[PDB]
Design a protein around this ligand. Structure first.
Ligand code: SF4
Ligand code: SF4
Ligand code: SF4
Lengths: 110, 51, 43, 314, 156, 176
């Protein structure tokens, strides 16, 4: 109940501040502006590099999720198996990184 | 000079006028942020470029 | 006459060379300090 | 009674970030042979108040946004995740004592990029969209390296509880067995909050240029609160203080001094180096930081096993 | 009465807040921009007055026209001025921005920037010294200080 | 008569290469830059307290224009139109006629302070030291037409700043 109260308090302070910032000088009287950036008429061209680093982040994030419970897992009784599996997980992460390195995957966003 | 007390023609050759013409050649194959260094590595003052 | 002139002995020497001090320990000593801190922390 | 605790948590955050703007201007100015503001108040103590009242009475921009929902919602999420993220901090006792406070802070760190994404989308200028995409990519990459470094340090600690970090650092600091992780963590938190030399939107466009004076001020408050809290997190994680259960004010004063020094170090780093390029900071992460992070992660997985130094779960 | 005193104190408060936090947007056109950067130097230090260095044009209060405004440049200046939030002020620095100066009779020079934007403070010189531009900024602060917006609103 | 900047071959022995590896693994030069900035923090800043303190100036300084007088009340200018002939910006407009006592005096002496480039050719072309550039520089106005000085304004400026202009001329005139 304390966490929900704190979340609600932070949220209501945030929207009170946003409403004040967005509406307090609206009641002032001024003059309006016309409806009109280097690329206004040009369309946005696709770039493969940003999407590639996005998916690389997603895959490394998934392997981070797999690697995360190691502090809890270090208190086990099969210490040899736990050490082997942890080292194998980080080794496969490094292998994926090196294979992305070798095949020019990290190019122009290195 | 035409023999009078005023110049007939006074052409000003500036170092920055010819350097800015080579900006397109020097910035070929470089990034957007590398261009602002090239305009910096040529000491360009636009009082002398445009005269 | 009285004119703005240098003194009769001339001005003093003026340095103009690049002077970087070359301070600090070597790479071996820096690495040894790093491993020593690591070993103390581990112990 | 608990709402009093919440208010005494959240109002000093706003006071601290306003005087952090003042301290930034003064310390930055004195490092380049001039003074900071000293005319508005006595030694410029009234400068943030004047700036706030000026910014809250300026005419709003009213941009031609494609969507108004994202335009409103981005400061909402930014301020909410800036202020919610302070609650599990053990100073020396947290507001909310949680079992997985580190995971909570990492989750809000991952969640904070939606403000950048929605601010970039809501603005009608596509150049702002490109800048927002680059900022999002930088933030998520350094999120990855933050997660791995935090995992290794907590594997030394043994549990996700943030208050246990005070107990595990009673004898010696964790900067002594984990100084490469400390250096890389500091640089990663520097690059997380778009701090120099890793800011890009100031150099050659911004994602939040289209916002009015008020919403820009709110984004500034969120960013500076993130900076202060990240320095406090680094202080708790690596430079823990001596805690006496009968005098908590000793720990409060000690870690306050340490986090103040770390924030001054942030401003000090801002006024020393030129700006990175975008591809250069990608090269710094993916080709320099990540292999060392994985190697040190393997080392810190295997080190407590071979030294009989496994920490307790509780 | 009570209301006149209240609006007078509120006007004084908002005047102090506006005049003590000026954020300028310079125009780096010509010589006078170099003298502006010499005013931002540690000797004179505009930043101690609350006047920040190189603010964004989207959040700036005062525009400083420092240089020569040509015919090829004036629509861009008008666009920048039109995209600036009120309350806004324009400071003309140097002879070129005031009345054309050396290039007054030129075919491609706007004879004064007051033909494009309304100017509050005229700083004379070629270039006017950094002390002169700082004095002009302080005079603009005095001009903002004696504003009477809320008194006019209450009286109307 | 020439030197080769950036033509240094670094040593390939183990000591120098280990020093380089320690430099790029422990950030030595970044610490050097931090130390430079930290040392520059503890120096006294060069910021003066304007307007209570003013920058140093020489008696050759060219500021606001003024029209001087003889030490009897008679104005120095005798309408010779040298200043308006030498003015590069054509800021000076002079109209003259003989007055009641028959002296050669001006009837209109305008200086356009928005045209003037503050070059000091008028004060060096004057044969009687009538027009001078005074030491005043804090004279910014709020209206464009206030920067259009006529004869009366320049005479008032001369009567206002004579006590300093005379001292500056006395200190400087031996170099002319
Ligand atoms: S007024 Fe003089 S110094 Fe200023 S831009 Fe014009 S020519 Fe240059
Ligand atoms: S200082 Fe030069 S430009 Fe100004 S009035 Fe005298 S001669 Fe003309
Ligand atoms: S040069 Fe001197 S005497 Fe001649 S018209 Fe000008 S101010 Fe008068």
């Amino acid at each position: 109940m304390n966490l929900m109260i704190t979340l609600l308090t932070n949220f209501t302070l945030a929207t009170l501040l946003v409403t004040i910032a967005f509406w307090l000088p609206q009641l002032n009287v001024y003059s309006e502006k016309t409806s009109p950036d280097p690329m206004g008429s040009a369309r946005l061209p696709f770039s493969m590099k940003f999407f590639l680093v996005a998916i690389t982040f997603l895959l490394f994030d998934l392997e981070i999720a797999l690697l995360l419970p190691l502090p809890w897992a270090s208190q086990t009784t099969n210490l040899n198996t736990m050490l082997t599996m942890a080292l194998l997980l980080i080794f496969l992460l490094a292998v994926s990184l090196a294979y992305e390195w070798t095949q020019k995957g990290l190019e122009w966003t290195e | 000079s035409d023999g009078s007390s005023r110049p007939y023609r006074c052409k000003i050759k500036a170092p920055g006028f010819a350097h800015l013409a080579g900006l397109d050649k020097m910035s070929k194959g470089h990034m957007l942020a590398d261009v602002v260094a090239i305009i910096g590595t040529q000491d360009i003052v636009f009082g002398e470029v445009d005269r | 006459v009285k004119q703005d002139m240098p003194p009769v002995g001339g001005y003093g020497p003026i340095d103009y060379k690049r002077n970087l001090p070359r301070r600090g320990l070597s790479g071996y000593s820096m690495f040894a300090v790093g491993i020593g801190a690591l070993l103390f922390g581990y112990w | 009674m608990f709402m009093i605790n919440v208010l005494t948590l959240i109002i000093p955050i706003l006071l601290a970030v306003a005087f952090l703007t003042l301290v930034e201007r003064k310390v930055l100015g004195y490092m380049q042979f001039r003074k900071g503001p000293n005319v508005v108040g006595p030694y410029g103590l009234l400068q943030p108040i004047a700036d706030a009242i000026k910014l809250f009475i300026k005419e709003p921009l009213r941009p031609a946004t494609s969507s108004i929902s994202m335009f409103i919602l981005a400061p909402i999420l930014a301020l909410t995740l800036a202020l919610t993220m302070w609650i599990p901090l053990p100073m020396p006792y947290p507001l909310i004592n949680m079992n997985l406070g580190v995971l909570f802070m990492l989750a809000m760190s991952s969640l904070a990029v939606y403000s950048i994404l929605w601010s970039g989308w809501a603005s009608n200028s596509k150049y702002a969209l490109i800048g927002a995409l680059r900022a999002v990519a930088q933030t998520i990459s350094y999120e990855v390296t933050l997660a791995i470094i935090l995992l290794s340090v907590l594997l030394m600690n043994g549990s996700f509880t943030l208050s246990t970090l005070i107990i595990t650092q009673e004898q010696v600091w964790l900067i002594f067995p984990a100084w490469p992780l400390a250096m890389m963590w500091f640089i990663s938190t520097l690059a997380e909050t778009n701090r120099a030399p890793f800011d890009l939107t100031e150099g050659e466009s911004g994602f939040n240029v289209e916002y009015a004076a008020g919403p820009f001020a709110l984004f500034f408050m969120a960013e500076y609160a993130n900076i202060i809290m990240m320095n406090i997190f680094t202080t708790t994680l690596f430079l823990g203080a001596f805690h006496n259960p009968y005098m908590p004010e000793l720990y409060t004063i000690n870690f306050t001094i340490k986090s103040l020094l770390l924030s001054i170090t942030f401003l000090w780093i801002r006024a020393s180096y030129p700006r990175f390029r975008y591809d250069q900071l990608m090269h710094l992460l993916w080709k320099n930081f990540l292999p060392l992070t994985l190697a040190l992660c393997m080392w810190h997985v295997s080190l407590p096993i071979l030294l009989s130094s496994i920490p307790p779960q509780t | 009465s009570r209301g006149e005193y209240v609006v007078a104190k509120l006007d004084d408060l908002i005047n102090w807040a506006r005049r003590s936090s000026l954020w300028p947007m310079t125009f780096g056109l010509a010589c006078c921009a170099v003298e502006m950067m010499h005013m931002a130097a540690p000797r004179y230090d505009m930043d101690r007055f609350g006047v920040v260095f190189r603010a964004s044009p989207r959040q700036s209060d005062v525009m400083i026209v420092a240089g020569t405004l040509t015919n090829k440049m004036a629509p861009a200046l008008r666009k920048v001025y039109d995209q600036m939030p009120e309350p806004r002020y324009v400071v003309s620095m140097g002879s070129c921005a005031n009345g054309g100066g050396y290039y007054h009779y030129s075919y491609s020079v706007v004879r004064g920037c007051d033909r494009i934007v309304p100017v509050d403070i005229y700083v004379p010189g070629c270039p006017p010294t950094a002390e002169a531009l700082l004095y002009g900024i302080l005079q603009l602060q005095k001009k903002i200080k004696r504003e009477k917006r809320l008194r006019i609103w209450y009286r109307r | 008569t020439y030197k080769y900047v950036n033509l240094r071959e670094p040593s390939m022995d183990m000591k120098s290469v280990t020093d380089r590896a320690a430099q790029t693994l422990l950030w030595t030069e970044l610490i050097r830059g931090l130390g430079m900035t930290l040392s520059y923090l503890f120096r006294e800043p060069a910021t003066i307290n304007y307007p209570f303190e003013k920058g140093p100036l020489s008696p050759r300084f060219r500021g606001e224009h003024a029209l001087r007088r003889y030490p009897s009340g008679e104005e120095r200018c005798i309408a010779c139109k040298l200043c308006e002939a030498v003015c590069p910006a054509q800021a000076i407009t002079i109209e003259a006629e003989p007055r009641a006592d028959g002296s050669r005096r001006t009837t209109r002496y305008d200086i356009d302070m928005t045209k003037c480039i503050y070059c000091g050719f008028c004060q060096e072309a004057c044969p009687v030291d009538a027009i001078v550039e005074g030491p005043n520089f804090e004279f910014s106005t709020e209206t464009h037409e206030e920067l259009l000085y006529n004869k009366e304004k320049l005479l008032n400026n001369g009567d206002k700043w004579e006590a300093e202009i005379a001292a500056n001329i006395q200190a400087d005139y031996l170099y002319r």
